[PDB]
Structure 1
Amino acid sequence: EEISKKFGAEREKALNDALKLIEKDFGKGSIMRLGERAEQKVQVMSSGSLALDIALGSGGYPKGRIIEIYGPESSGKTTVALHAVAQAQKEGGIAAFIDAEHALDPAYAAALGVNIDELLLSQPDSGEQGLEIAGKLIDSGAVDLVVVDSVAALVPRAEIDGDIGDSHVGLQARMMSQAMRKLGASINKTKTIAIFINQLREKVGVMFGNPETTPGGRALKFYASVRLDVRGNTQIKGTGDQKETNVGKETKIKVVKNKVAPPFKEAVVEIMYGEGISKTGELLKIASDLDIIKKAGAWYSYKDEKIGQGSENAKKYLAEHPEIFDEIDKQVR
């Protein structure tokens, strides 16, 4: 016979028996009160560019969660991922960049100074084998940054064999959702950062909202903790061979979904072709905005008096003087 009619008793030792019975089967940290749940606090890793994570509040992507990137074509998708790869690899944590569209140039990564010899990579044929590779590489290993590019190009297995022009209703999104339901609970276990980047397809006929959307199904936007999109519009003509020649592209990044900081605070980044995120280009620009450095004429007056008035102002010697860096940024932080 079973146990009789029970109300919650008005003294609370009874759930201690439930705690002891839970600990019999499902380990040790299955039920913890939140006060001594020490690893539940947010852990932060930066993004290289200070203006990017002046917007994310904390100071970078929170560990153990899902971040994702999307936006229009040729507008700064892989560059931010490469800079996060280099900044993450600068503390010895191993980073793994799988591919889907085979677009990564090795010398472009060499131009951003990231190590090719300690960069894992895979170019899968189908999307299934590549995402399986990422899944098996995350859980057993202690790698630090897994990054899947171009979820549009993760083709599913059941249409890589069929003829071109067959009906395949609901096959990309089902694979992506059934994949991330498996990968969701494992990633926070190992405190690892994952970024899925994306492309854009339209959606034909809606009377509300913006007519753009991402592919890969609606299961992605639920799980992710921070969503950034980029909208690269114009380029800047520098003093290339003392002439107005295309040498840098202007862009902007704004956060769309966020849950560790207030959202919708945007950011402006400059990108030079073949050179990536100009951190020295944004450092002296943004420090004159809150005026911790001087805003003046040809010389921003300091102890050195070696400042030109151009796109090059102080980068010739702040490479050899990195010691001004710490006292000019963390004040807003």
Structure 2
Amino acid sequence: MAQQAPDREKALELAMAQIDKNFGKGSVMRLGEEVRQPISVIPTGSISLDVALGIGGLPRGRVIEIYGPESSGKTTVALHAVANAQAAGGIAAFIDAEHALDPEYAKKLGVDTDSLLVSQPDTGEQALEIADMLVRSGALDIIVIDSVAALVPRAEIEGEMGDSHVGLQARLMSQALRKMTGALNNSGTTAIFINQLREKIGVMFGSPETTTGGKALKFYASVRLDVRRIETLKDGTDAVGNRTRVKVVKNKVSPPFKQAEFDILYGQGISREGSLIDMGVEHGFIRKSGSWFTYEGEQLGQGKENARKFLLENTDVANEIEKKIKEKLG
């Protein structure tokens, strides 16, 4: 009228709404928001991690990337990811390109191997196809491709080509990805890609940042987990496991930048127990000091691991805590 107008807020969310309607949901966010609870999500075995994913676990219907150095967790997470959506009626396909999977490990974590679909492609091209048409059938829910890096095209090798044009791999990805993101979730079949290595504070190396097939996946991924090993879980003797830190650096399904930790015991998986003590204390329900963890009056033991076994063998109480923790969160 000759007036500018609405209180920032009343005009911000007026446009901020416009945005969503034009580019989607996760398009704009206030890191603080609790924002929605879509009734879909694969638990990640770590109450720790999935209360950080903002939706109780990996969002069914989304390409999920889990990069991170070697021997730090990704797949152990992945496998668990499978175990669950599998142990809930789901069928998980696994496109192996690393040729390094130990079923009895996947077994100990609760994966039904015999009913697990494995595939060992020959070209990084074929792989994306058998996994593209394997996901179009809508039978699989969770499909995990091992190594966004070991996906070398027919013209071969990863980091070699030439003349009047150049770049291989990152294209096949670009390709597969578009063509796969579509279908991928009309079916609601969430996908997971293990990617990996070169850091713990900054990406430097040969042909540095971003990566091998990166870019595309780095843009299609609706979630990205930076899984890096932090410390070697001592066990009095040498060591029971490793503690893992996860920095969900990209979350299109809620707020990003959060993070969780948890342990992985050498052959046994992500410790549900240890994970309840941690959560259990960082939210009160479990009291400390004296190095004696105590669940409201009743004690658990003297020293993480001891209270850890207590919870291991005492499921009754354990469930309670997982519980109390559950609604104290979401």
TM-score by length of 1: 0.77
Match of 2:305 among 291, 301, 311: 311
Could you say which residue in structure 1 is the equivalent of 2:9? none
How much has 1:326 moved relative to structure 2?
1.8
Q: Does the CA contact (< 8 Å) of 1:70 and 1:214 recur in 2?
A: no
Match of 2:281 among 267, 281, 288: 288
Distance in 2, Cα, partners of 1:236 & 1:212:
30
Q: Does the CA contact (< 8 Å) of 1:200 and 1:215 recur in 2?
A: no
3-state secondary structure, aligned to 1:218: helix
Q: Is 2:50 the partner of 1:53? A: yes
Higher normalized helix content (fraction of residues):
2
How much has 1:316 moved relative to structure 2?
4.3
Could you say which residue in structure 1 is the equivalent of 2:267? 274
Equivalent AA in structure 2 for residue 295 of structure 1: K
Spell out the pairing of 1:62-77 with structure 2 (5 A cutoff). 62-77=59-74
> After the TM superposition, which of the residue ranges 71-80 and 98-107 deviates more from structure 2?
71-80
How much has 1:204 moved relative to structure 2?
6.5
Structure-2 change in CA distance of 1:89 and 1:173 (3 Å): same
Could you say which residue in structure 2 is the equivalent of 1:105? 102
Distance in 1, Cα, partners of 2:205 & 2:101:
32
How much has 1:229 moved relative to structure 2?
0.7
Q: Does the CA contact (< 8 Å) of 1:42 and 1:63 recur in 2?
A: no
Spell out the pairing of 1:99-178 with structure 2 (5 A cutoff). 99-159=96-156, 167=162, 169-178=166-175
How much has 1:231 moved relative to structure 2?
1.4
Q: Does the CA contact (< 8 Å) of 2:80 and 2:110 recur in 1?
A: no
Could you say which residue in structure 2 is the equivalent of 1:15? none
Spell out the pairing of 1:1-333 with structure 2 (5 A cutoff). 43-159=40-156, 167=162, 169-200=166-197, 212-239=209-236, 243=237, 245-297=238-290, 298=292, 300=294, 302=296, 305=299, 307-313=301-307, 314-319=310-315, 321-324=317-320, 325-333=322-330
Structure-2 change in CA distance of 1:305 and 1:69 (3 Å): closer
Distance in 2, Cα, partners of 1:252 & 1:308:
24
Give the paired residue count.
285
TM-score by length of 2: 0.78
Structure-2 change in CA distance of 1:309 and 1:222 (3 Å): closer
Which aligned runs of 4 or more in structure 1 are off by greater than 6 angstroms?
none
Q: Does the CA contact (< 8 Å) of 1:234 and 1:249 recur in 2?
A: yes
How much has 1:49 moved relative to structure 2?
0.8
3-state secondary structure, aligned to 2:155: helix
Q: Does the CA contact (< 8 Å) of 2:41 and 2:58 recur in 1?
A: yes
Structure with max Cα Rg: 1
Distance in 2, Cα, partners of 1:247 & 1:126:
38
